[PDB]
């Protein structure tokens, strides 16, 4: 099914973290990533700006894109970011990989899922 070996590794790591540190978000994200690419999140910034609050990490089971404006200072964790998205986010906040999210927060506390 999946041909990207890094996507598979990501998914395997998300499961290991959910089964141990009890973060149910990571399991939820793993299952969505296992679903067809078609269903994966593609989120622009306007959507993150609208639903995010500070000191709550935004989690995108998918990829973050660059339309819209992000003022809020937030940590956004995603499978990938467009070049523009990562640049706009790093100005007011922090763009981070899901692999880092799992490291800093294996229990998946204080996160909000956004698609």
Partner RNA sequence: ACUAUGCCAGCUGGUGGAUUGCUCGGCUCAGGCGCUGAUGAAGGACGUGCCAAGCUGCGAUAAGCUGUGGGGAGCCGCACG
Partner RNA sequence: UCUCAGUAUCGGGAGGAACAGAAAACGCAACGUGAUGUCGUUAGUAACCGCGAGUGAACGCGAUACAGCCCAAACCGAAGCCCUCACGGGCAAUGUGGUGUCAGGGCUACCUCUCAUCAGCCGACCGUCUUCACGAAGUCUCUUGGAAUAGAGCGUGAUACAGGGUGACAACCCCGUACUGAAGACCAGUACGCUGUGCGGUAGUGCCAGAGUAGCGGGGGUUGGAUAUCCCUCGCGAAUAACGCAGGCAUCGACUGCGAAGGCUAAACACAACCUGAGACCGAUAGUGAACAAGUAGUGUGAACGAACGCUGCAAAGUACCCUCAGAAGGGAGGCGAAAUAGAGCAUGAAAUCAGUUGGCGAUCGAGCGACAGGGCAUACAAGGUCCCUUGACGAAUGACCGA
Partner RNA sequence: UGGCAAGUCUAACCGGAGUAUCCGGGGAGGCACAGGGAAACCGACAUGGCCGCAGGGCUUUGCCCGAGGGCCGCCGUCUUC
Contact residues: RNA, CB under 7 A = 1-4, 7, 23-25, 28, 35-38, 42, 44, 46-47, 49-51, 53, 56, 63, 65-69, 80, 82-85, 107-115
C-alpha to C-alpha distance for 107 and 60, rounded to whole angstroms: 17
Q: Which does 54 bind (CB under 5 to 8 A by kind): RNA, other proteins, Cl ion, none?
A: Cl ion
Largest CA distance in the chain: 38
Binds Cl ion by CB under 5 A, chosen from 4, 9, 20, 53: 53
Beta strands in the chain (DSSP E): 41-43, 57-64, 75-81, 94-97, 111-113
Q: Is 4 a binder of other proteins (CB under 8 A)?
A: yes
């Amino acid at each position: 099914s999946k041909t990207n070996p890094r996507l598979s590794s990501l998914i395997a790591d998300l499961k290991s973290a959910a089964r141990s540190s009890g973060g149910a978000v990571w399991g939820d994200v793993a299952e969505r990533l296992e679903k067809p690419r078609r269903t994966h999140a593609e989120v622009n910034l306007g959507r993150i700006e609208r639903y995010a609050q500070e000191d709550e990490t935004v989690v995108v089971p998918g990829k973050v894109l660059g339309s819209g404006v992000l003022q809020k200072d937030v940590t956004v964790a995603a499978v990938d970011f467009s070049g523009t998205a990562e640049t706009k986010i790093d100005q007011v906040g922090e763009a981070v990989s899901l692999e880092q999210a799992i490291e800093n927060n294996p229990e998946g506390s204080h996160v909000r899922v956004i698609r």
